[PDB]
Design an enzyme around this catalytic site. Structure first.
Site, PDB file in Angstrom:
ATOM      1  N   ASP A 129       0.729  -1.298   0.070  1.00  0.00           N
ATOM      2  CA  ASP A 129       0.141   0.032   0.125  1.00  0.00           C
ATOM      3  C   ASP A 129       1.009   1.389   0.052  1.00  0.00           C
ATOM      4  O   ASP A 129       0.581   2.243   0.487  1.00  0.00           O
ATOM      5  CB  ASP A 129      -0.964   0.109   1.147  1.00  0.00           C
ATOM      6  CG  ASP A 129      -2.098   1.148   1.103  1.00  0.00           C
ATOM      7  OD1 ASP A 129      -2.756   1.264   0.178  1.00  0.00           O
ATOM      8  OD2 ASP A 129      -2.204   1.723   2.139  1.00  0.00           O
ATOM      9  N   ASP A 156      -6.241  -9.525   5.970  1.00  0.00           N
ATOM     10  CA  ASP A 156      -7.173 -10.361   5.651  1.00  0.00           C
ATOM     11  C   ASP A 156      -8.887  -9.540   6.035  1.00  0.00           C
ATOM     12  O   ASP A 156      -9.714  -9.847   5.423  1.00  0.00           O
ATOM     13  CB  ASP A 156      -7.393 -11.731   6.296  1.00  0.00           C
ATOM     14  CG  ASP A 156      -6.431 -12.537   5.851  1.00  0.00           C
ATOM     15  OD1 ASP A 156      -6.130 -12.707   4.591  1.00  0.00           O
ATOM     16  OD2 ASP A 156      -5.791 -13.263   6.684  1.00  0.00           O
TER      17      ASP A 156
END
Ligand SMILES: C#Cc1ccc(Nc2c(C(=O)NOCCO)cc(/C=N/OCCO)c(F)c2F)c(F)c1
Ligand SMILES: Nc1ncnc2c1ncn2[C@@H]1O[C@H](COP(=O)(O)OP(=O)(O)OP(=O)(O)O)[C@@H](O)[C@H]1O
Ligand SMILES: [Mg+2]
Length: 272
Positions: A129, A156
């Site tokens: 990211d 997750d």
């Protein structure tokens, strides 16, 4: 050893999806630190696992990674206490600077590809990211990375991440599950290009922005120097295996003339 009550809220550095950091004072040590508060609707078990895998950040030590003080749970809020970066993020800097040099972006690039190789070669983890709002700098001239995937369970629980309006997501990662480390490059690439053009270099709700990114060709540049084209683009190759890997760029020409040169950065930021 960081409890919710040894904290005094000062302001609010910023927000986002699920997160929202504040500048806070750790009352008992007098230290000023940024307190991220992710929320997430998770159960006790999974949560404790997230708070646990988050301890790895005590071993994540490098001039290129933001400092981390502690992580813990409290009222549906996973707190991640990291160092305070008075200079904000290379996103905030943007919003108040129209565009950024190059003698500079060559420095913001050394930061990133040295912080990526660190995370990749000392923690076997990819950022996942990397972008401007996640690249922070301080008044002391330092440039560091933050918000990287260090907790598999946290990654997750963040599955619903294709929201927003922009997207530093690589094409192979928008198509399916065929992707890894090389994906961080397309991200840094789409960053350097945005930090040279005062706006998301692409070209519309997100479903349409995504489709467009995987279909037509990757941004380039409008006017701009040498390597900053044979780099910004050796970063935007839509085929992950043909794109350049860290190893390469860490010797590429744009990088060649940079850690070699001697730009201040500090003063630029301090006065921009
Ligand atoms: C030094 C340091 C430091 C390192 C990391 C984080 N935080 C995160 C964030 C994170 O903070 N992201 O910002 C969103 C929260 O508002 C997201 C993920 C998960 N990735 O899943 C989405 C990618 O697909 C993760 F695993 C994290 F550890 C941090 F706060 C400080
Ligand atoms: N250590 C820090 N020091 C100073 N400011 C910080 C620090 N960490 C994050 N920030 C700032 O806090 C704000 C919130 O960060 P956050 O990661 O939640 O949002 P984001 O990265 O902008 O967006 P998104 O949630 O989509 O990733 C941003 O404006 C960011 O620059
Ligand atoms: Mg962030």
């Amino acid at each position: 050893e960081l409890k919710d009550d040894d904290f005094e809220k000062i302001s609010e550095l910023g927000a986002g999806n699920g997160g929202v950091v504040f500048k806070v004072s750790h009352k008992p040590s007098g230290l000023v630190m940024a307190r991220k508060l992710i929320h997430l609707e998770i159960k006790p078990a999974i949560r404790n696992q997230i708070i646990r895998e988050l301890q790895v950040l005590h071993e994540c030590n490098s001039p290129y990674i933001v400092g981390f003080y502690g992580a813990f749970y409290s009222d549906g809020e996973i707190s991640i206490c990291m160092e305070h970066m008075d200079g904000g993020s290379l996103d905030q800097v943007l919003k108040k600077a129209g565009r950024i040099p190059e003698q500079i972006l060559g420095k913001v690039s050394i930061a990133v590809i040295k912080g990526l190789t660190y995370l990749r070669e000392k923690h076997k983890i990819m950022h996942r990211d990397v972008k401007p709002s996640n690249i922070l700098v301080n008044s002391r001239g330092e440039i560091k990375l933050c918000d990287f995937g260090v907790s598999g369970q946290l990654i997750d629980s963040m599955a619903n991440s294709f929201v927003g309006t922009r997207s530093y997501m690589s094409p192979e990662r928008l198509q399916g599950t065929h992707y890894s480390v090389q994906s961080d490059i397309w991200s840094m690439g789409l960053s350097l290009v945005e930090m040279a053009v005062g706006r998301y270099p692409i070209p519309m709700a997100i479903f349409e922005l995504l489709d467009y990114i995987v279909n037509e060709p990757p941004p380039k540049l409008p006017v701009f120097s040498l390597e900053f084209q044979d780099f910004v683009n050796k970063c935007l190759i839509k085929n992950p295996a043909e794109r350049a890997d860290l190893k390469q760029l860490m010797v590429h020409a744009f990088i060649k003339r940079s850690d070699a040169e001697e730009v201040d950065f500090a003063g630029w930021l301090c006065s921009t």
